[PDB]
Amino acid sequence: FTRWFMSTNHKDIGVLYLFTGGLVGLISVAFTVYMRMELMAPGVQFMCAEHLESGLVKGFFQSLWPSAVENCTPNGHLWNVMITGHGILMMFFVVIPALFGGFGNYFMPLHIGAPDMAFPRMNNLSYWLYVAGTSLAVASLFAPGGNGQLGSGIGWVLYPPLSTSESGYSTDLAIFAVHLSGASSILGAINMITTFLNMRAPGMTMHKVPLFAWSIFVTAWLILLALPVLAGAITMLLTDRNFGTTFFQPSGGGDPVLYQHILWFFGHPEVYIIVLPAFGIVSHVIATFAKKPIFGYLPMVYAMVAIGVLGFVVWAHHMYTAGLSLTQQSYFMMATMVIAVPTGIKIFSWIATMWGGSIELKTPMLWALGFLFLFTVGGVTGIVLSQASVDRYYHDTYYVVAHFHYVMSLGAVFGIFAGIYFWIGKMSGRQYPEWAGKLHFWMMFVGANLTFFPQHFLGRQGMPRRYIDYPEAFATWNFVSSLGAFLSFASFLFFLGVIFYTLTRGARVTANNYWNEHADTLEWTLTSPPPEHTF
Amino acid sequence: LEIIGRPQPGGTGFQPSASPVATQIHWLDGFILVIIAAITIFVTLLILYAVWRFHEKRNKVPARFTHNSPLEIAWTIVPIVILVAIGAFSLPVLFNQQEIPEADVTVKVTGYQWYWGYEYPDEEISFESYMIGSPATGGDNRMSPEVEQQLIEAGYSRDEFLLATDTAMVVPVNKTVVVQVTGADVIHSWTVPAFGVKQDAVPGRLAQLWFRAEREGIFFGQCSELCGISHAYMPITVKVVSEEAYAAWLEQHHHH
Numbered sequence: 001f002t003r004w005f006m007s008t009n010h011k012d013i014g015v016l017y018l019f020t021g022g023l024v025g026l027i028s029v030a031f032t033v034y035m036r037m038e039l040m041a042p043g044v045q046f047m048c049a050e051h052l053e054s055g056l057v058k059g060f061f062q063s064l065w066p067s068a069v070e071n072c073t074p075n076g077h078l079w080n081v082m083i084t085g086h087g088i089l090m091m092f093f094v095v096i097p098a099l100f101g102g103f104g105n106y107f108m109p110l111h112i113g114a115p116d117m118a119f120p121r122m123n124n125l126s127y128w129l130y131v132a133g134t135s136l137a138v139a140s141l142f143a144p145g146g147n148g149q150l151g152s153g154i155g156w157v158l159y160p161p162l163s164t165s166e167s168g169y170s171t172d173l174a175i176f177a178v179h180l181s182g183a184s185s186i187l188g189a190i191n192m193i194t195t196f197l198n199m200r201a202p203g204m205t206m207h208k209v210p211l212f213a214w215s216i217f218v219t220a221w222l223i224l225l226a227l228p229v230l231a232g233a234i235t236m237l238l239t240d241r242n243f244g245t246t247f248f249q250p251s252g253g254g255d256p257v258l259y260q261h262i263l264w265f266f267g268h269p270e271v272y273i274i275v276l277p278a279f280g281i282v283s284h285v286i287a288t289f290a291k292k293p294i295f296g297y298l299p300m301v302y303a304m305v306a307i308g309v310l311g312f313v314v315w316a317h318h319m320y321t322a323g324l325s326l327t328q329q330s331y332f333m334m335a336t337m338v339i340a341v342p343t344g345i346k347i348f349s350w351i352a353t354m355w356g357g358s359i360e361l362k363t364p365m366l367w368a369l370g371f372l373f374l375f376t377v378g379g380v381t382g383i384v385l386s387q388a389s390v391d392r393y394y395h396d397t398y399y400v401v402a403h404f405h406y407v408m409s410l411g412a413v414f415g416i417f418a419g420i421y422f423w424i425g426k427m428s429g430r431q432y433p434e435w436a437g438k439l440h441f442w443m444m445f446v447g448a449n450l451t452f453f454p455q456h457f458l459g460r461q462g463m464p465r466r467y468i469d470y471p472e473a474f475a476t477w478n479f480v481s482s483l484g485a486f487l488s489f490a491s492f493l494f495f496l497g498v499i500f501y502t503l504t505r506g507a508r509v510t511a512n513n514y515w516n517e518h519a520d521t522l523e524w525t526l527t528s529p530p531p532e533h534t535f
Numbered sequence: 536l537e538i539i540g541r542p543q544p545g546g547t548g549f550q551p552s553a554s555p556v557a558t559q560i561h562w563l564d565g566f567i568l569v570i571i572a573a574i575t576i577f578v579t580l581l582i583l584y585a586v587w588r589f590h591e592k593r594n595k596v597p598a599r600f601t602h603n604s605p606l607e608i609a610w611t612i613v614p615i616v617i618l619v620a621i622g623a624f625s626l627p628v629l630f631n632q633q634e635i636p637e638a639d640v641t642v643k644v645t646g647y648q649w650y651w652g653y654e655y656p657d658e659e660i661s662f663e664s665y666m667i668g669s670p671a672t673g674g675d676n677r678m679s680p681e682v683e684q685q686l687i688e689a690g691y692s693r694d695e696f697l698l699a700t701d702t703a704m705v706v707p708v709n710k711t712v713v714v715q716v717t718g719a720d721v722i723h724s725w726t727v728p729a730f731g732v733k734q735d736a737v738p739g740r741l742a743q744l745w746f747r748a749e750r751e752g753i754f755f756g757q758c759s760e761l762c763g764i765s766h767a768y769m770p771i772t773v774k775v776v777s778e779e780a781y782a783a784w785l786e787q788h789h790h791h
């Protein structure tokens with residue numbers, strides 16, 4: 001009933017992370033729908049200052065209906081708040097909780113034959129810190145913030161002096177949210193590493209561990225280095241705002257650019273923390289539905305280790321226009337390019353896995369194959385951006401937006417969906433209906449490409465990031481992008497419907513392994529769902 | 536003057552180049568685009584072929600291989616070579632961009648919430664530059680009859696709303712302009728797509744960029760670091776004019 005939340009079992013914690021990540025994801029996606037309503041056409045029609053003089057509730061409902069421009073005073077602060085909320089929720093409160101907190105907690109112990117995490121009580125606390133962080137993030141949207149309004153309009157990376165001069169305490173609430181997220185992540189990482197190292201089953205040697213378990217292990221190490229650095233960066237923002245320090249304020253001999261070095265030291269590793277567990281899921285899924293063992297097991301592990309390590313020495317590719325010396329720029333450009341090599345090894349090995357196989361195009365496999373194509377499109381755009389000389393033009397334009405949505409919303413998220421369809425039978429004892437899984441895939445596939453591919457054009461034409469409104473010439477591709485986002489949203493609501501149907505009246509799962517023998521890890525050896533106590 | 540540096544309806548390419556640096560960006564990005572279009576077409580065709588060829592109906596018994604040394608070597612070395620190639624063309628372009636030459640004209644630019652301040656230290660000229668339609672010009676950041684009229688009066692049209700400012704940075708063609716950029720309050724970013732330039736305006740730091748405009752005209756940029764409520768409403772207008780018209784503009788500003 002209500003002891004779902006006081007449970008210390010890795011399977012229950014994993015389910016709670018998945019559901020919660022899903023719900024926050026819905027909230028953050030709803031924000032992007034409203035964003036794309038405003039970007040659908042030039043001129044501001046929705047985010048009108050006039051809506052501020054109503055109730056909180058009435059104002060909300062009025063802001064969902066378009067006004068004529070002559071009746072709509074543009075409210076840039078609300079745009080900035082929405083965007084900041086969207087980003088913070090995704091990067092801290094959705095995708096890592098789903099992959100790492102969710103599938104990680106559920107499946108890693110199963111994959112290594114551990115009965116539970118090393119410290120189950122710590123694991124339960126991990127979850128509550130995530131919920132507390134989320135609540136603070138959400139509350140920040142309703143707290144006194146910038147420009148005498150509610151909410152922080154400062155961007156998900158909180159650059160000073162903008163972030164340190166924003167009025168109200170909304171920004172302080174956001175900083176505390178992020179601290180709580182980091183704490184949740186660190187506790188999780190402690191558990192994953194200890195469990196992985198100590199609690200493997202007899203015979204389960206380091207080079208017998210499934211790739212998903214490896215992806216979680218490597219990810220956990222990245223969290224231990226990256227998240228403490230972030231805790232430092234944002235604490236310094238907090239003291240600049242409230243306790244008289246001057247770390248980032250030039251009047252006291254501070255330097256705003258220093259914040260950027262510290263923040264991006266976390267900020268790059270953050271994206272590899274997002275995508276590594278998705279690499280792990282893709283390996284399991286492609287092996288299963290190709291009916292063929294994963295190609296190059298050892299290079300797959302070492303490629304993940306290499307990506308992880310390299311992800312710590314590239315941060316200033318986020319700072320090419322911020323005053324970096326030509327030497328710094330040249331170094332970070334070359335260091336970044338190297339990442340394409342181990343990543344390329346993983347993409348080719350996934351294709352090599354399919355080669356000579358017996359391919360079954362079930363829903364999980366569709367997500368995996370979409371991932372290969374779409375993550376490649378995003379990764380290759382990331383290589384464009386590593387070239388400082390071209391980044392001169394693209395930096396803080398929609399080309400960057402297109403990059404990161406291809407790798408995240410058409411990459412990591414495709415990994416999340418692959419995992420859901422792959423494992424829902426195993427976790428619930430009910431099977432999803434196949435035709436609906438495929439329909440979800442195609443609607444999302446068409447919609448997300450329509451949303452983001454045109455943003456490459458917008459960036460090339462010079463459309464800046466974080467703008468409520470834009471010159472009339474950007475109209476066409478913004479319109480197409482918005483229609484794509486509306487279709488993607490329809491696909492997500494349909495997905496939630498598919499999940500609801502599955503858990504409520506989906507076909508009863510009868511087999512331990514309802515896939516095939518090439519799903520050869522320990523979870524497929526157990527009942528569906530597994531016993532409360534396994535191993 | 537011709538309006539050259541601006542987005543065009545339905546555009547999918549870069550803004551027109553009006554500098555040798557912007558020309559270099561177009562070439563380098565063009566070269567890399569061909570490469571990455573090839574990589575992704577390649578990858579995509581391999582996927583679709585493998586799904587067609589090895590579909591469970593057509594290949595009933597799966598192979599079990601997990602190694603292929605020649606191919607594994609090839610698919611490591613080729614990416615390495617592709618990247619070294621890109622590096623070899625990209626680093627010169629980078630060096631050209633970031634090595635600041637000797638200035639014919641020096642402009643110091645300051646970012647403010649939410650407008651730009653310009654100073655010409657050789658000429659003892661300074662002025663501020665606000666979006667036409669901002670509160671400074673009587674507006675509230677949206678189109679209106681009054682805003683359209685002001686755009687007309689300044690030599691623009693309603694199509695340039697959100698790009699055109701009340702005053703412009705004017706410079707002579709075919710001269711080396713060095714711009715020194717800083718921020719007064721928060722970080723802003725100064726940019727002109729047609730020139731292939733962008734540099735953050737950071738409080739407490741003075742950073743430099745250069746361009747040499749190769750044709751006369753009007754070229755727009757927009758502030759490129761989120762800086763608060765009117766981030767979307769503090770753009771950049773550069774007018775590139777003849778050497779004689781530039782001197783005329785200078786004399787117009789001279790106080791006797």
Ligand code: HEA
Nearest residue numbers: 271275317340343344379380382383385386395404407614
């Ligand atoms: C999952 C999340 C994720 C991932 C995995 C990546 C992966 C990569 N990222 Fe991305 N990125 C983001 C999320 C992500 N990024 C976000 C959120 C931002 C914006 C932050 C902000 O400002 O808000 C950003 C911004 C960003 C920038 C800054 C742009 C700017 O602000 O101006 C840069 C610059 O170098 C960059 C580069 C790269 C590169 C080179 C990779 C590489 O890892 C890609 C490697 C993959 C491939 C290259 C494809 C597969 C390889 C092959 C098929 C082999 C053959 C290929 C070649 C020879 C090229 N990213």
Ligand code: HEA
Nearest residue numbers: 022025032087090098155156408409465466467485488492
């Ligand atoms: C995981 C990361 C993620 C994801 C999934 C998305 C999803 C989307 N984003 Fe996101 N976006 C960011 C991260 C992400 N975004 C970040 C970090 C920024 C920068 C913020 C800043 O500037 O400070 C940004 C900025 C940003 C902008 C630019 C704002 C600006 O510059 O002013 C836009 C514009 O259209 C946009 C649109 C969208 C849309 C339409 C979607 C979606 O509607 C696309 C469709 C996808 C779906 C419908 C499915 C989503 C599924 C999940 C999220 C999984 C949920 C979990 C479970 C099911 C377990 N985003």
Ligand SMILES: CCCCCCCCCCO[C@@H]1O[C@H](CO)[C@@H](O[C@H]2O[C@H](CO)[C@@H](O)[C@H](O)[C@H]2O)[C@H](O)[C@H]1O
Nearest residue numbers: 011012015018019022023420424427428429430499529
């Ligand atoms: C948008 C988010 C998407 C998330 C999708 C993933 C959903 C997975 C949820 C599965 O939840 C499971 O539900 C079972 C019920 O179906 C539970 O068994 C429970 O119910 C059984 C009866 O059916 C009993 O025998 C068990 O003791 C009792 O634990 C089981 O423990 C629980 O983990």
Ligand SMILES: CCCCCCCCCCO[C@@H]1O[C@H](CO)[C@@H](O[C@H]2O[C@H](CO)[C@@H](O)[C@H](O)[C@H]2O)[C@H](O)[C@H]1O
Nearest residue numbers: 433434435436439440443489490491492493494495497
């Ligand atoms: C807010 C978002 C809005 C999105 C709305 C999405 C609309 C969904 C279309 C409904 O039509 C369905 O099509 C299925 C596929 O054709 C049918 O399955 C039928 O056909 C399948 C054959 O592929 C079989 O597997 C099934 O058993 C059989 O029920 C199903 O009955 C039918 O209702």
Ligand SMILES: CCCCCCCCCCO[C@@H]1O[C@H](CO)[C@@H](O[C@H]2O[C@H](CO)[C@@H](O)[C@H](O)[C@H]2O)[C@H](O)[C@H]1O
Nearest residue numbers: 432433434435436493494495496497498499501502507
């Ligand atoms: C915004 C909310 C969006 C809501 C979208 C929800 C989508 C979920 C639809 C599930 O569709 C079900 O699929 C089953 C599996 O295909 C069908 O079983 C049908 O097919 C089976 C398999 O052949 C038969 O055994 C059954 O008797 C026959 O009813 C069933 O009819 C159909 O309703």
Ligand SMILES: CCCCCCCCCCO[C@@H]1O[C@H](CO)[C@@H](O[C@H]2O[C@H](CO)[C@@H](O)[C@H](O)[C@H]2O)[C@H](O)[C@H]1O
Nearest residue numbers: 348349351352355356581600601602603604606609610
């Ligand atoms: C860079 C782009 C990435 C593209 C990805 C596509 C990869 C496809 C190439 C794989 O080629 C196959 O590899 C097998 C393993 O090397 C060979 O089997 C050979 O070696 C096996 C290993 O024992 C034997 O079982 C076989 O009989 C013998 O034919 C087989 O001939 C060859 O066609």
Ligand SMILES: CCCCCCCCCCCCC
Nearest residue numbers: 030033034037064065066067
């Ligand atoms: C001029 C009348 C056009 C009607 C616009 C309808 C907009 C509906 C948006 C509501 C959807 C909420 C996400």
Ligand SMILES: CCCCCCCCCCCCC
Nearest residue numbers: 361366369370373582583586
């Ligand atoms: C099993 C036959 C159903 C038809 C499948 C359509 C082709 C799927 C292509 C997969 C590539 C996804 C990017």
Ligand SMILES: CCCCCCCCCCCCC
Nearest residue numbers: 033037040041045066486489
């Ligand atoms: C010129 C006014 C255009 C506004 C049209 C409103 C369309 C909103 C559709 C929202 C779709 C939400 C799913």
Ligand SMILES: CCCCCCCCCCCCC
Nearest residue numbers: 377456547548549571572575
């Ligand atoms: C392989 C993915 C790269 C996506 C970039 C698309 C840009 C295409 C625009 C071409 C216009 C050239 C003038």
Ligand SMILES: [Ca+2]
Nearest residue numbers: 038041043044
């Ligand atoms: Ca609009």
Ligand SMILES: [Cu+2]
Nearest residue numbers: 267268317318
């Ligand atoms: Cu990065």
Ligand SMILES: [Cu+2]
Nearest residue numbers: 723758762766
């Ligand atoms: Cu600004």
Ligand SMILES: [Cu+2]
Nearest residue numbers: 758760762766
């Ligand atoms: Cu700005």
Ligand SMILES: [Mg+2]
Nearest residue numbers: 395396759760
């Ligand atoms: Mg920037």
Ligand SMILES: [O-]
Nearest residue numbers: 267268269271
């Ligand atoms: O990144």
